[PDB]
């Protein structure tokens, strides 16, 4: 059971977008697909659902005309179209499979802005147990994902929520390894910015 949601998106005010929610692993027409609006800060908000097969669509009154739900049985994929975009529509959008394990999609960060994409500049942060870091500075839009040594270091990692200052985002990430392992062994942070299709690695020397 898979609910592969489409890629992160940046779109101007007034325009439209289409998010997909590709189901796989079970029979598509056995369940409904709900779309939820996620935060920032707090709160999940139900937008509506669609029936594959049936075609029955239910909406939240707030989202009628705002959101348009579709499904394509031939490709097992639910869609949501969002229209006349304002910055209040900047949020993470989650699709879910109706639960009567409970499966949700991974999320799709939609950003509504006149700004352009800037990939982040990743800076290495070098000095019993040592702490290293990476500064992921000045990017747009969200998200960014940081790993250390391709997912091999984890428990000593603390990645920080991005903060928007002067129309750009900056987040940092720290890893704390034993002094015994760095610099003898390599520590590299891997930073992905999906909206600019960059994957950047920086060895901390």
């Amino acid at each position: 059971v898979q609910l592969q949601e489409s890629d992160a998106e940046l779109v101007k005010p007034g325009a439209s977008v289409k998010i997909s929610c590709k189901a796989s692993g079970y029979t598509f027409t056995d369940h409904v697909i709900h779309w939820v609006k996620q935060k920032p800060e707090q709160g999940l908000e139900w937008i509506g659902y669609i029936s594959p097969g049936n075609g029955d669509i239910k909406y939240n009154e707030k989202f009628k005309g705002k959101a348009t739900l579709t499904a394509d049985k031939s490709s097992s994929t639910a869609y949501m179209q969002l229209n006349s975009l304002t910055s209040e529509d900047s949020a993470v959008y989650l699709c879910k499979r109706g639960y009567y394990v409970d499966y949700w999609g991974q999320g799709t960060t939609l950003t509504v802005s006149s700004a352009k994409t800037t990939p982040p500049s990743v800076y290495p942060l070098a000095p019993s147990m040592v702490t290293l870091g990476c500064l992921v500075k000045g990017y747009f839009p969200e998200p960014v994902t940081v790993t250390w040594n391709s997912g091999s270091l984890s428990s000593g990692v603390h990645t920080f929520p991005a903060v928007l200052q002067s129309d750009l985002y900056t987040l940092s990430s720290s890893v704390t390894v034993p002094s015994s392992t760095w610099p003898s062994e390599t520590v590299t942070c891997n930073v992905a910015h999906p909206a600019s299709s960059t994957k950047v690695d920086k060895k901390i020397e």
Binding site: W46, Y123, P124, T131, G133, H158, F160, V163
Partner: protein, 211 residues
């Protein structure tokens, strides 16, 4: 249908109890559910049809109510229960509550501070950022005083705390001071000072440029 959740956020002891309320706008006839949302993970259903616990969910999670008035409780709090919790009526369509972001208390823990110079790659640009991590501390409250040549620098700072550690109940915090490459080079001493409840005098970390 509107659903009103309270509290918006809460802080409860380890091994203690918590009660979250939801108030429906109409009778929703016990068709309410409660979800646990951990950062970057599953909204996980815990309780459906007011009181029916979903499988494997401990006895210490409970749900009550009828009509319009509903409650949910968790007693004997464990660190693993750090999450934002939501109610959800599914009587007529679906409506979430506003959420309750839960924190679980812990023994006060002093932060591990780490100052880092600007990278030589950043100095290729006209900017130079000094970063400071104050890792795994409890009592979220903390002052990060920056000092450049013994003098406090307030403007040009970026702070961000992590969400509470699900395993050990501490927070982490990152403060970044950015300057121009030339303003950075006019000075020597860079200090990241930390005011926390666990010490009566700041946990300070520095570096000197012309050293």
């Amino acid at each position: 249908i509107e659903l009103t959740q309270s509290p918006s956020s809460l802080s409860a002891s380890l091994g203690g109890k918590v009660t979250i309320t939801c108030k429906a706008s109409q009778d929703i006839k016990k068709y309410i559910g409660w979800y646990q949302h951990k950062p970057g993970k599953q909204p996980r259903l815990l309780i459906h049809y007011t009181s029916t616990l979903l499988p494997g969910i401990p006895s210490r999670f409970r749900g009550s109510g009828s009509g319009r008035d509903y409650s949910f409780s968790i007693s004997n709090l464990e660190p693993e229960d750090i999450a934002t919790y939501y109610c959800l009526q599914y009587y007529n369509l679906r409506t979430f509550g506003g959420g309750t972001k839960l924190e679980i208390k812990r023994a006060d823990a002093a932060p591990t501070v780490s100052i880092f110079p600007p990278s030589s790659e950043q100095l290729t640009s006209g900017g130079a950022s000094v970063v400071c991590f104050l890792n795994n501390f409890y009592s979220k409250d903390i002052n990060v005083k920056w000092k450049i040549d013994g003098s406090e620098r307030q403007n040009g700072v970026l702070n961000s705390w992590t969400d509470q550690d699900s395993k050990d109940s501490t927070y982490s915090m990152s403060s970044t001071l950015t300057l121009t490459k030339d303003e950075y080079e006019r000075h020597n001493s860079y200090t990241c000072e930390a005011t926390h409840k666990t010490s009566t005098s700041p946990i300070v970390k520095s570096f000197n440029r012309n050293e």
